[PDB]
Design a protein around this ligand. Structure first.
Ligand SMILES: O=P(O)(O)OC[C@H]1O[C@](O)(COP(=O)(O)O)[C@@H](O)[C@@H]1O
Ligand SMILES: [Cl-]
Ligand SMILES: [Cl-]
Ligand SMILES: [Cl-]
Ligand SMILES: [Cl-]
Lengths: 245, 253
């Protein structure tokens, strides 16, 4: 495995690779072990005060589940990286963020701005103090913890307008992260319009941890890391072994 | 039922149904204010009640609070494997929304091996912003599902206890006091005659909606809640109450 990690690192240009045992597509509990490893990676990188941006999805929900209070007692503020991506509440960044904060015995900020508001309603809402302040907090994140999905899988699960499904399909999206759909070369081919973190913003976040696994995600994971992301990947053998096959 | 004979529960249930306008009364032994395990027994009885009421397909609306949490903790899969979708009955708007019904909803659905849909948890926003959000198709779908609820399982609280437990605006605290609220259920505070005197700023189920819900199960007990329970049921609610001797004996004698 030491070798598997080193090879994955070089292939994907990662800051580091953390690989847990097994294939989460065959053994669901393996997702909880990715969660556990992610938490450990987070705690390695915390400073005295931390603003942690987090996405939704079931894998970051596993991070939240495995979260425990910080032993050194460092200060932790969690914020949802970006909302209004059309997920059911169980899968919203806003939900996962609150859950993680609770488990870490930290604090969190709520941010709910849904996907399909009118131009006027969207323009007005993002100027409201509670939103404006949280957007600023997200802008100054010291950490980002995010998932990676297959494009088709994400597009189906979310409430995706028909015209956008077409675009995602016609532009050969294969992977998705934080509301960006990318093709096989790591290029953006569809951006979901939503407030909060933008792709350009991630270069300003010193510690980024991606958490994604399962053999079925091998292609999505490879595609996402086709460009430099300055990111630590937590994955499992299922994804890593299939990617490197 | 030697048991419920000797413990006097069957006779107590009869009288409680005659006194309040109950669809049915289910009373477990003891006083949950004195004996915390009695809450777990209310949860047990409530779960059994739900299972007797389920149709082929169900949309079960739930409230938060420790009593419905105990219902969720006691929930087990349906041996008949009927279709079970759980939703929160309401969601909060305004400052520091916690949406604890969401918490209980997910917990109960997981225990039942059912499915669930939660309500959004907003930050502090203008009414205009809330009005825009409510019409958003994804949000609208959940509200429509709550509107189609086949069952409602809810707590009942003392008005003062709840207004104080919650992040209640000072203007609304004054209103609740000045209008002599004595009881609370699902985001509505009622006076001693069971009339609404204040409604929490929320989305989801409204009091007028409960008539259309075939099965409503209130779960609330302890001597401290006798006055609140009596007040809530001063008006007809077509509701099955699961409670304890603590509440029932104090109310009746
Ligand atoms: O069962 P408990 O702990 O006495 O709580 C009962 C109360 O909890 C609730 O069900 C839910 O409280 P919230 O609406 O603040 O989340 C109230 O409607 C009810 O008054
Ligand atoms: Cl495995
Ligand atoms: Cl463990
Ligand atoms: Cl979302
Ligand atoms: Cl949900």
């Amino acid at each position: 495995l030491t070798l598997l990690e080193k090879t994955l690192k070089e292939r994907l240009n990662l800051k580091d690779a953390i690989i847990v045992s097994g294939d989460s597509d065959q053994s669901p509990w393996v997702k909880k072990e990715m969660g556990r490893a992610a938490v450990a990676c987070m705690k390695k990188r915390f400073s005295g005060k931390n603003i942690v941006a987090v996405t939704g999805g079931t894998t970051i929900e596993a991070v939240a589940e495995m979260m425990t209070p910080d032993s050194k007692n460092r200060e932790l503020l969690f914020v949802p990286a970006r909302g209004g991506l059309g997920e059911d509440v169980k899968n919203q960044a806003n939900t996962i963020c609150a859950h993680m904060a609770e488990k870490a015995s930290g604090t969190y900020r709520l941010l709910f701005v849904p996907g399909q508001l009118s131009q006027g309603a969207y323009s007005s809402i993002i100027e409201e103090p509670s939103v404006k302040e949280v957007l600023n907090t997200i802008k100054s994140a010291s950490m980002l913890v995010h998932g990676i999905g297959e494009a088709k899988t994400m597009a189906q699960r979310r409430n995706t307008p028909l015209e956008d499904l077409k675009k995602i399909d016609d532009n050969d999206a294969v992977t998705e992260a934080f509301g960006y759909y990318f093709n096989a070369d790591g290029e953006v081919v569809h951006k979901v319009h939503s407030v909060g973190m933008q792709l350009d913003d991630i270069d300003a976040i010193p510690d980024i941890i991606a958490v994604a696994g399962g053999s079925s995600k091998a292609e999505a994971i490879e595609a996402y890391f086709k460009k430099p992301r300055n990111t630590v990947l937590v994955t499992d053998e299922g994804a890593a072994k299939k990617l490197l096959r």
